[PDB]
């Protein structure tokens, strides 16, 4: 045991020396010359009200119009953002829901939480009635995040420290992703959907190979638990939001941290993180009730969204990048533009 | 023409959401900690009690879910010193950023202390209340010391000694929590 701990510490030093060798110039030195974005001022265009209790998660459709949201009253509402009309309202078996996902096809919606089960809901059907199609019961801890690859495959991160790739048809785990020591809180799929990154309560982010089923790279830099993780549209970087009141940008090819997005004024943690379509802006949701817009390249703060009176839980950007949706504990969704 | 059909569907959902709004506010949610949901009625009052038996001993993330619950039912038994472990858990929940408005109904079940608590050596039984009572009320006051330290009148602790009538105790304590919440709002308390 004492030998392998010495061998483990020896390799960690070799990885740190390899990471310091490839580091010559910081992202700030390259981005010092290029002009600032200016003041990004954005207003609540829509206020979606219907949820009784606090909203824990939301997700956009691939049509960039329909979005689904989950609240702890045990309801799962699919909204029409353009017209503010409700399309579906789904009563859940377990009222304690923490994650919801919208299928890229737009045919299914997934959600789960403290029940330790991921429930797939068919939105189409011949009847035109919303019913739970399959219930995935493998995780021994609460479901934190779930994201579809296609109609038949879905990845889930739970509080039992494991991520799991599911086959929805047969309803059994195809691959288990073991590595994290703490609760895995968020997932993010690459554009190619051949890799995903997961942020856990061990202050570590891990890059996974979906096809093979093993961890490729482990990213460290955050002090406390990583609550939110989001892939940079390029697919060669990702941003992580932690309880240490910092967001950080990591490069997959450089295998190290690039930038930190922190201000002395901010002492609360980051719940949610999402990029703009170009990636130039980084939006982060805080538990001081407001969202901060960051210049991803320059690290300076661009603007603020100050609509919610309670904790901002989730934060989504449309595929066409026209809007940004914030869910909150005040039980309101707000569309910013 | 298509926008007219979307309004009709939106009307059905809002009519159903109005019926659910009354059932949600009428029901009193409870958290029990020392995966199952239980719904019961006492005097035609709906209670929805969640048990956290199927989760890991790392609580700091999933505990945040119960920031709007009516009351937490904290059960404690009276080798490793399990009583101090329970005091530390109570202290965390009480001083938590999101649980600092939530009252706690305490249940002390199963009925040396001087070795594990040196403050007991000089402790005397309260007049409001035998080496059994001295112990019983020492452990009670140990939990009440934490609840009176940071409360600020927003939430209170309701101790009880367990060994059938336990369901009625939670009913009466929930009444007091709601009463005290409103009385403080109207500035009468």
């Amino acid at each position, epitope marked *: 045991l004492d030998q392998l701990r010495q061998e483990a510490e020896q390799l960690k030093n070799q990885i740190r020396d390899a990471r310091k060798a490839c580091a010559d110039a910081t992202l700030s030195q390259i981005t010092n010359n290029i002009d600032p974005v200016g003041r990004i001022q954005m207003r609540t265009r829509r206020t979606l009200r219907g949820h009784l209790a606090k909203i824990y998660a939301m997700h956009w459709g691939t049509d960039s119009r329909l979005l689904v949201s989950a609240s702890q009253d045990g309801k799962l509402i699919i909204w029409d953002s353009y017209t503010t009309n409700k399309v579906h309202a789904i009563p859940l078996r377990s009222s304690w829901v923490m994650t919801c996902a919208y299928a890229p096809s737009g045919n299914y919606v997934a959600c789960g939480g403290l029940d330790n089960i991921c429930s797939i809901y068919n939105l189409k059907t011949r009847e035109g009635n919303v019913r739970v199609s399959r219930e995935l019961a493998g995780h021994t801890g609460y479901l934190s995040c779930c994201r579809f690859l296609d109609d038949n495959q879905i990845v889930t991160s739970s509080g039992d*420290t494991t991520c799991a790739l599911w086959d929805i048809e047969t309803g059994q785990q195809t691959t288990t992703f073991t590595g994290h020591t703490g609760d895995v809180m968020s997932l993010s799929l690459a554009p190619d959907t051949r890799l995903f990154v997961s942020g856990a309560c061990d202050a570590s982010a891990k890059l996974w190979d979906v096809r093979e089923g093993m961890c490729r790279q482990t990213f460290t830099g955050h002090e*406390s638990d990583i609550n939110a993780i989001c892939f940079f549209p390029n697919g060669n970087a990702f941003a992580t939001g932690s309880d240490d009141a910092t967001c950080r940008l990591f490069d997959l090819r450089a295998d190290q941290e690039l930038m930190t997005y922190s201000h002395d004024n901010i002492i609360c943690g980051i719940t949610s993180v999402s990029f703009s379509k170009s990636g130039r802006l980084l939006l982060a949701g805080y538990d001081d009730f407001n969202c901060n817009v960051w210049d991803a390249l320059k690290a300076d703060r661009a603007g603020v969204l100050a609509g919610h009176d309670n904790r901002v839980s989730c934060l989504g950007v449309t595929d066409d990048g026209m809007a940004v949706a914030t869910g909150s504990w005040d039980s309101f969704l707000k569309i910013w533009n | 023409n298509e926008e007219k059909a979307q309004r009709e569907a939106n009307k059905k959902i809002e009519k159903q959401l109005q019926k659910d709004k009354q059932v949600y506010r009428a029901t009193h949610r409870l958290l029990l900690l020392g995966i199952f949901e239980t719904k019961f009625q006492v005097d035609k009052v709906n209670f929805h009690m969640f048990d956290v038996g199927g989760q890991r*001993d*790392e*609580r700091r993330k999933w505990i945040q879910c119960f920031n709007d619950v009516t009351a937490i039912i904290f059960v404690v038994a009276s080798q*490793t010193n399990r009583l101090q*472990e329970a005091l530390n858990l109570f202290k965390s929940i009480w*001083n938590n950023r999101w649980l600092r408005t939530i009252s706690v109904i305490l249940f002390l079940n199963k009925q040396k202390i001087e070795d594990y608590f040196p403050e007991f050596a000089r402790y005397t039984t309260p007049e409001d209340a035998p080496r059994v009572t001295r112990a019983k009320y020492f452990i009670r006051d140990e939990f009440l010391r934490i609840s009176t330290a940071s409360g600020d009148g927003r939430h209170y602790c309701y101790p009880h000694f367990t060994c059938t009538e336990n369901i009625r105790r939670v009913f009466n304590d929930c009444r007091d929590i709601i009463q005290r919440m409103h009385l403080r709002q109207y500035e009468l308390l």
Partner: nanobody
Amino acid sequence: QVQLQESGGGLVQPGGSLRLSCAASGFTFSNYKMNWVRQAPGKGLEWVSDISQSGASISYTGSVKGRFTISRDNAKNTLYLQMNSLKPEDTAVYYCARCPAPFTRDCFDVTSTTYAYRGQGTQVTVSS
């Protein structure tokens, strides 16, 4: 990367003294509340003492009260535990654990078996 290293353990005679040090790196030491926790042979992890960010609010378990003193330096990111008049029921692996989030009053999961922000631990043996 968050890294805590315990040193200052060993075999001491009953009624003797030891001084446990805890070297911290990868976080702002001054922003976090610090704890000591021990795991005796054939027992569970039990909390010993904690010390606030500044070093004002201090608490112990009854067993160690008057015999143990927790002190922290902020210039040097180290946590100390001065152990006086030790008895054989103190024999345990002492771990150096910090609360999960900075600035927060509450301190969760510090004895949670799988806790991430906890050191490797140092062995203390009280025998004749």
